[PDB]
C-alpha cells in the first residue's frame, strides 16, 4: 500500500545522490539493517532506506546511535527523521551517507508495513 507515502521525503535520495548536499532533514523509512563485516569492534550497521520514491543501500549508522539498533527502537519498517548526516564520495563515484543524528518518528510496530513501492536508486 502507498497511501502513507506522503509521510516520506520523496526525492531526498535522488537529491543526496545528485547534489550531495547535507542541509536537509529528510524523513525516511528503514527497510533493513545489516551488520557490516568489519572483523573488529565496534559493530557497524548498514541500512537500506526508502524515501517513498527510491531506496538506497549505502547508509552507515554512526557508532553513537548503535543503542537504537541494539534496543530495537530503530528497526525495519520504522519511520525516522535524519537530523545530521555526512556525505562521503568514494573514488569510484558512489556516495556513502553516514547518519550522525536521527529521531524515530514512528516505531516499526506503529507503521506495520513497507510504505509504497520505492525503486532501487541506480546508484
Amino acid at each position: 500500500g502507498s497511501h502513507m507515502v506522503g509521510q516520506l521525503s520523496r526525492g531526498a535520495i535522488a537529491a543526496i545522490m545528485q547534489k550531495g548536499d547535507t542541509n536537509i532533514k529528510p524523513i525516511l523509512q528503514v527497510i533493513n539493517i545489516r551488520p557490516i563485516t568489519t572483523g573488529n569492534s565496534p559493530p557497524r550497521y548498514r541500512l537500506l532506506m526508502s524515501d517513498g520514491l527510491n531506496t538506497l543501500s549505502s547508509f552507515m549508522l554512526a557508532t553513537q546511535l548503535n543503542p537504537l539498533v541494539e534496543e530495537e527502537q530503530l528497526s525495519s519498517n520504522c519511520v525516522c527523521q535524519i537530523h545530521r548526516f555526512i556525505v562521503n564520495t568514494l573514488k569510484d563515484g558512489r556516495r556513502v551517507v553516514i547518519l550522525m543524528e536521527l529521531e524515530v518518528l514512528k516505531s516499526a510496530e506503529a507503521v506495520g508495513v513497507k510504505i509504497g513501492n520505492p525503486v532501487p536508486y541506480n546508484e
Binding site: 562521503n88 568514494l90 569510484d92
Partner: peptide, 13 residues
Amino acid sequence: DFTADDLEEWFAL
C-alpha cells in the same frame, strides 16, 4: 571513529 579508507574497504566491489 573511522577513516575514508575504512569506507572504501567496507564498500569494496
